[PDB]
Structure 1
Amino acid sequence: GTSKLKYVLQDARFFLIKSNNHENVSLAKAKGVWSTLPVNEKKLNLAFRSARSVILIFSVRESGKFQGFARLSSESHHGGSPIHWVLPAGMSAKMLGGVFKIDWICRRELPFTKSAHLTNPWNEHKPVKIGRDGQEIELECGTQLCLLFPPDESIDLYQVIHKM
């Protein structure tokens, strides 16, 4: 059903995460971790204390899709393991240093064609697919966006609800 998902999303905050390649999203799905630039790490740390759930919605650049969504389970922490991210041009390992732990809520894809009816008030009402890495997505838009994803029957939200 969708009832536990709706409970998790209640009063949540949502952020668009853009990844330059698929390898880093695969690594995040396998290990339950995400790292971002210091400008966004600061925003996510602030949001984690402010909301019952902080949801990251992932999209690999140029894929035309979202690859799933996850809930922050921790603030960022350093010196836990060297995650073998695929660092793009200009990008380095010292900036991707703060590591957040995340719990995946949906590992299924959603094509942008399916979200064309959702606009984000916090990005000038552009389609929710549009935004820089870290763009906050307003509550109602983000909730409806997550509800569009195919259900991920491999995931039991019972343990997520207990983290809250």
Structure 2
Amino acid sequence: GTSKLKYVLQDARFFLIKSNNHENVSLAKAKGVWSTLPVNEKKLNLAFRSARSVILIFSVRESGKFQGFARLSSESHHGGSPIHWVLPAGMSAKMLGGVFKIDWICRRELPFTKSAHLTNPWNEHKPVKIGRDGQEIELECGTQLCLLFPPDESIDLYQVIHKMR
């Protein structure tokens, strides 16, 4: 069912995350981490203190799909074990901000064709698939987008609900 999912998403904030490739999303799914450029890191840290859940919705460039969504479990931190991201040409590891711990809520994909009826007011009401890395998605659009994903029966949201407290 979808009731615990709706509870997690209640009054959440949502951010679109772009990855240059699938390798980085695979690493994020395996290790429960993400790192973004400092401009976006600042927004995510602010949002983490402001809302019960901050949701990252991932899309690999040119894939025509979203690859899942996850909830921030911490603000960003530095000085951990190096994650071997396969970074875009022109982006060094030193250019990234810190590392956010994340809990995956859905590891299933959603094709852009299924979200064509959703627009993001914070990006000029363009289709939600359209947007820059780090773009905030307004509450109602973000909630409906997350609810379109196929259910991920491998995930138990009981563990995430207790972190919201």
In the superposition, the TM-score normalised over structure 2's length comes to: 0.99
Q: Distance in 2 between matches of 1:69 and 1:119?
A: 18
CA displacement, residues 77-128 of structure 1 (integer Å, 9 cap, x when unaligned): 0011100000111101012240000000000000000000000000000000
Deviation at 1:37, TM superposition (A): 0.3
Residue 73 of structure 2 corresponds to residue 73 of structure 1: yes
Q: How many residue pairs get matched?
A: 164
CA displacement, residues 44-65 of structure 1 (integer Å, 9 cap, x when unaligned): 0000000000000000000000
Is contact 1:32-1:103 (8 Å) kept? yes
Q: Distance in 2 between matches of 1:152 and 1:95?
A: 33
Is contact 2:45-2:76 (8 Å) kept? yes
Question: Cα distance 1:139–1:6, how it changes in 2: closer, same or farther (>3 A)?
Answer: same
Is contact 1:69-1:104 (8 Å) kept? yes
Q: Which residue of 2 aligns with 1:57?
A: 57
Dislocated runs of 4+, deviation >6 Å: none
3-state SS, counterpart of residue 93 of structure 2: coil
Query: Superposition RMSD on alpha carbons, in Å?
Result: 0.5
Please list every run of 5 or more consecutive structure 1 residues that lacks an aligned counterpart in the other structure.
none
Question: Cα distance 1:109–1:7, how it changes in 2: closer, same or farther (>3 A)?
Answer: same
In the superposition, the TM-score normalised over structure 1's length comes to: 0.99
Is contact 2:19-2:58 (8 Å) kept? yes
Q: Distance in 2 between matches of 1:87 and 1:34?
A: 12
Question: Cα distance 1:89–1:53, how it changes in 2: closer, same or farther (>3 A)?
Answer: same
Is contact 1:36-1:95 (8 Å) kept? no
Is contact 2:41-2:97 (8 Å) kept? no
Please list every run of 5 or more consecutive structure 2 residues that lacks an aligned counterpart in the other structure.
none
Is contact 1:76-1:98 (8 Å) kept? yes
Q: Distance in 1 between matches of 2:133 and 2:64?
A: 15
Identity %: 100
Q: Which residue of 2 aligns with 1:147?
A: 147
Q: Distance in 1 between matches of 2:88 and 2:123?
A: 26
Q: Distance in 1 between matches of 2:69 and 2:115?
A: 14
Q: Distance in 1 between matches of 2:108 and 2:48?
A: 24
3-state SS, counterpart of residue 145 of structure 2: helix
Q: Distance in 1 between matches of 2:38 and 2:21?
A: 19
